[PDB]
């Protein structure tokens, strides 16, 4: 089963397969680039997460980030449980050198459609994973 998410590392692995991928090391330091996941199903049974060859901000996916400004530092950090409000969520993690794979599993229908963001940081480079999960599709 595929991971609806973003692979930022240059390590292509069969242990985890991502729908989208963007090599972070090829992104400029001053660029505002994001990789976008949009789920729109009546009921869900999906893996969502990312593979970051650097550092993950915040501690995704137990914490996520909902922004309201083009700020440099988040500090507006919410928790996935309160944001999705689907009850018990299964969280995952795996390593592969500097590669950090963080996942979560969503099963069922969510009350209100919600969006959140996770940041992959490599040196001065920074890419956003923005996911949107629809309520009814």
């Amino acid at each position, epitope marked *: 089963k595929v991971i609806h998410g973003c692979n930022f590392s240059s390590n292509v692995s069969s242990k985890h397969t991502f729908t989208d991928s963007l090599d972070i090391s090829l992104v400029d*330091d001053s660029a505002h680039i994001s990789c976008n996941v949009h789920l729109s199903e009546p009921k869900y049974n999906h893996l969502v997460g990312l593979n970051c*060859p*650097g*550092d*993950i*901000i*915040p*501690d*995704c996916f*137990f*914490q996520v980030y909902q922004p309201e400004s083009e700020e*440099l*530092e*988040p*500090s507006n*950090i919410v928790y996935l449980d309160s944001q999705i409000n689907i009850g018990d969520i299964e969280y995952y*993690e795996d390593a592969e050198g*500097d590669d*950090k794979i*963080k996942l979560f599993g969503i099963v069922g229908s969510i009350p209100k459609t919600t969006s959140f963001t996770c*940041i992959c*940081k*490599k*040196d*001065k480079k*920074s890419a956003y994973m923005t996911v949107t999960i629809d309520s009814a599709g």
Partner: antibody
Amino acid sequence: EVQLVESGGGLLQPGRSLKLSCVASGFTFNNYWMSWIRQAPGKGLEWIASISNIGGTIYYPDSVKGRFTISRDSAQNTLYLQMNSLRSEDTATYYCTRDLRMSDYFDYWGQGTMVTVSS
Amino acid sequence: QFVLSQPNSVSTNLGSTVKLLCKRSTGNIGSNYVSWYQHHEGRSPTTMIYRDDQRPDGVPDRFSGSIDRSSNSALLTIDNVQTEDEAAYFCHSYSTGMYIFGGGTKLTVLG
């Protein structure tokens, strides 16, 4: 304001166990990386350990890898650095910092604690 | 990943101008942010410069951070040197997984 107050430490012998405390206050504790920085006598600053907001990421250099353990308490607002199987080399002034991971610097430093290991 | 190199010790006079270097061994100095820390003896280090050229509140306009790409090194510049500036200065930079500190430069204000 933000305050970082360290505790623990003292005089130990090689092979024992120590646990330092760092009580943080004045900010949302679960939203910041925390680190431990030491300064050996007659030496420069040396990084020891870093932990993320909820411990989703932990780093060590190869010197204290396996010997030291860094963790935190969300409710007590305290950061710890468990020290086991020490050495005379670990005799240093141990500092506690709050980190801004997105900017890769330490914006607030603790008052510093002294750990002396000798036989 | 790399090593930051600083002069062991330097010395200038009052009201003069000193530049403390921080040479990165391998890689580009601009690929990673650089931070500067002032350390007095028996005192906690205080942040002097963050992400290359930013100066936190409470740090005098005297101190400024700069990136010299030709020498692949960062510079902490202190105009109108004061005796209170006499301390140790450390540069810092982070690569994924390891925090790099320079050796530190013990500044001396010839008073």
